[PDB]
Design a binder for this molecule. Structure first.
Ligand SMILES: C=C(C)[C@]12C[C@@H](C)[C@@]34O[C@](Cc5ccccc5)(O[C@@H]1[C@@H]3C=C(COC(=O)Cc1ccc(O)c(OC)c1)C[C@]1(O)C(=O)C(C)=C[C@@H]41)O2
Ligand SMILES: CCCCCCCCCCCCCCCC(=O)O[C@H](COC(=O)CCCCCC)COP(=O)(O)OCCN
Ligand SMILES: CCCCCCCCCCCCCCCC(=O)O[C@H](COC(=O)CCCCCC)COP(=O)(O)OCCN
Lengths: 536, 80, 72
């Protein structure tokens, strides 16, 4: 075998299987060749910034991956040296994980991978009826289904969830069970196992908390059983709880606004109470407001601990939690300054108050029509203004320093007031009143007119055109965006749930087949779906 | 959406100010509305406390509503 | 016929017509089967917020709707 760092562990059997040469494989296996060798050089491992070919490091996985069903059958079923269908590589990946990884959501590849997947499952059932390949987790704890959902393999996912094998003696490998059909209608049961209640890493968790780079993040919720599940969870429990939460947040903000408005205007906090009604209501409001701030603080901390988001995607996802957390930070800093006897607690408090109202836009998501505004505001701030800020600041600091250098003793001989004036000129509310009679008036005029043409006319309309295209880009993606946000809300509501209730299941723990390989029966928490299709 | 922003910054500004032309919800809501459609002032000639916080709040409002939200509305109306 | 809230009034002839079995339809009609029964359960009525198959509740309407001119 190769001994270098690149081809480490490769042997003749791997080359023969790659070459699709049945004869050499037969000869090598006949001579006692190891069918469980690991080929674990850098060429054969998972990697992002390097060309390579990952297949799971084993000959059986290689034979499956290259679309050689005959060699898979020969490796498993020949007696000279049978192959372990349940073998795991260094990553923990089985053959099914390897097949999931080498998908690319194209038609032909999807046919290849799906077909080889199914044939491997049949061979496993025949050879080892007591073996459950699909439950085997790789080193990240991911099953093949969880892995497929994680990587955005829409084709493999859609295949697995809608799997129906019309063959006796292996119907336990099905997940879809068509109970009946009429003309356009048909009713089936879907297996549902490890979709919602998995106890390690369910499908919906993986789709929801994906890192926004997964290609088919929205499409994966359109696959039938998931979409019906989310609709059912929405209509049953989550909808009412959502509206209740929104109402409570509104009450909280009203109490906070009223408490803030009627603050005392005397010196030196904290302010002692008088035995009067107004002080009792004011201090009651203050206590409730601070309590709400503490609550949001701890919810934010629990979020960041549970998710552990990386810095690069810290803002790309989790924008909403960041803003709620920052609101609570302003509240706590306000409390600290309040008891520390500084009037400047007011300066913190109002910022929290302002943020408290605009975070109402968090609750517009989950509506088909209104969530588009919150999505657009998020994306425009995170992409258009933040890129544009540096360009505009280059222009502003350039002309501000030029003007301030030119002027001696005026309202323009100060960087602060000059930066303000030029900023106002950018948004079309300056003056251009040249009534003063200082030296270098001509140069001053030429500088300001060049600034006004370059920033008010050119740059600002460039920004507006780019924002306009961003707005048009995601006008038509509205339905997808809405669906994904509703899914995230449902998952969070299930996580918190605040009433000792764990009725997260949909339909009963009913007998699915009743006929395992052995003499037991399976109850699998199936879910009934009746669909309508007007084909023919 | 616009009323969420307007009531937010109006209440913040009114809470911050004690005894001015901005210590009133009515005149403050008017002033911020005028800022939305590009005919405010931004004249900070007054000398009250918390001038820096007042300036930061108003500039954040002007960027968020005159630049960002209004052009969002105009783009959507343009597509309609 | 079915007596439940969903398939109320469905009989053999509707199933035969749905299944596209000319022979069974002939046999049932020969034996005095009712050709003007109403299959009027919730599965068979007009509805928007439910899967279903509205066809007019009668075997003649069903045969016409499924594109089986011979049975009509
Ligand atoms: C931490 C961030 C990212 C942030 C926090 C504050 C300072 C913020 O300004 C920014 C910077 C900024 C300032 C001025 C104009 C544009 C951007 O953007 C947000 C942040 C951005 C906004 C924009 O208004 C919104 O629509 C908030 C919002 C949008 C989408 C949502 O899904 C949402 O749910 C939580 C909230 C609101 C502010 O938090 C706010 O109310 C104040 C006073 C300033 C806005 O800083
Ligand atoms: C939309 C894209 C195309 C834009 C084209 C820009 C056209 C701008 C129109 C010209 C504005 C001229 C400004 C007024 C001139 C002026 O009033 O000032 C001049 C001083 O010289 C200048 O400013 C030079 C002119 C500036 C050079 C050119 C940018 C003379 O001094 P006085 O004020 O004392 O006049 C004597 C006492 N009343
Ligand atoms: C298009 C998208 C990109 C937009 C980028 C925005 C850039 C805008 C820059 C404008 C800055 C204006 C600074 C105001 C200066 C000022 O006028 O106030 C200063 C105090 O400074 C401050 O306010 C704090 C800083 C505020 C910083 C706010 C980000 C006190 O001066 P005096 O009253 O004593 O003046 C004595 C004589 N009158």
């Amino acid at each position: 075998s190769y001994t270098d760092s690149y081809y480490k562990g490769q042997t003749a059997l791997h080359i023969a299987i790659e070459r699709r040469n049945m004869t050499l494989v037969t000869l090598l296996v006949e001579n006692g060749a190891d069918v469980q060798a690991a080929a674990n050089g850098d060429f054969f491992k998972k990697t992002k910034g390097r060309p390579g070919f990952y297949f799971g490091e084993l000959p059986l996985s290689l034979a499956a991956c290259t679309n050689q069903l005959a060699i898979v059958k020969f490796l498993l079923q020949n007696s000279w040296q049978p192959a372990d269908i349940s073998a795991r590589d260094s990553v923990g990946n089985t053959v099914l994980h390897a097949l999931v990884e080498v998908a690319d959501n194209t038609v032909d590849n999807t046919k290849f991978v799906t077909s080889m997947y199914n044939e491997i499952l049949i061979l496993g059932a025949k050879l080892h009826p007591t073996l459950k390949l699909e439950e085997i987790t790789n080193r990240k704890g991911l099953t093949p289904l969880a892995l497929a959902a994680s990587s955005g393999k829409i084709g493999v996912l859609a295949y697995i969830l809608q799997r129906e094998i019309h063959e006796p003696e292996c119907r336990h490998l099905s997940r879809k069970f068509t109970e009946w059909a009429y003309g356009p209608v048909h009713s089936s049961l879907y297996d549902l196992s490890c979709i919602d209640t998995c106890e390690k890493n369910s499908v919906l968790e993986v789709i929801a908390y994906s890192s926004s780079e997964t290609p088919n993040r929205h499409d994966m919720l359109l696959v039938e059983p998931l979409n019906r599940l989310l609709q059912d969870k929405w209509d049953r429990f989550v909808k009412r709880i959502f509206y209740f939460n929104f109402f409570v947040y509104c009450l909280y903000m009203i109490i906070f606004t009223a408490a803030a408005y009627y603050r005392p205007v005397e010196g030196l906090p904290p302010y002692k109470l008088k035995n009067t009604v107004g002080d009792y209501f004011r201090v009651t409001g203050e206590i409730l407001s601070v309590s709400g701030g503490v609550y949001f603080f701890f919810r934010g901390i629990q979020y960041f601990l549970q998710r552990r988001p990386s810095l690069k995607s810290l803002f790309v996802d989790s924008y909403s939690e960041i803003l709620f957390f920052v609101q609570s930070l302003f509240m706590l800093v306000s409390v600290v300054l309040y008891f520390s006897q500084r009037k400047e607690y007011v300066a913190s408090m109002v910022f929290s108050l302002a943020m408290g109202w605009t975070n109402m836009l968090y609750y517009t998501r989950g509506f088909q029509q209104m969530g588009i505004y919150a999505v657009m505001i998020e994306k425009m701030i995170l992409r258009d203004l933040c890129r544009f800020m540096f360009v505009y600041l280059v222009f502003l600091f350039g002309f501000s320093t030029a003007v301030v250098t030119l002027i001696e003793d005026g309202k323009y001989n100060s960087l602060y007031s000059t930066c303000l004036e030029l900023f106002k000129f950018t948004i079309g509310m300056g003056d251009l009143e040249f009534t003063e009679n200082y030296d270098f008036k001509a140069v001053f005029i030429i500088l300001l007119l060049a600034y006004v043409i370059l920033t008010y006319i050119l740059l600002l309309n460039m920004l507006i055109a780019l924002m306009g295209e961003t707005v048009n880009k995601i006008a038509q993606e509205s339905k997808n965006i809405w669906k994904l946000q509703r899914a995230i809300t449902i998952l969070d509501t299930e996580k918190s749930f605040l009433k000792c209730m764990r009725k997260a299941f949909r339909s009963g723990k009913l007998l699915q087949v009743g006929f395992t390989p052995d003499g037991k029966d399976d109850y699998r928490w199936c879910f009934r779906v009746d669909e309508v299709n007007w084909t023919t």
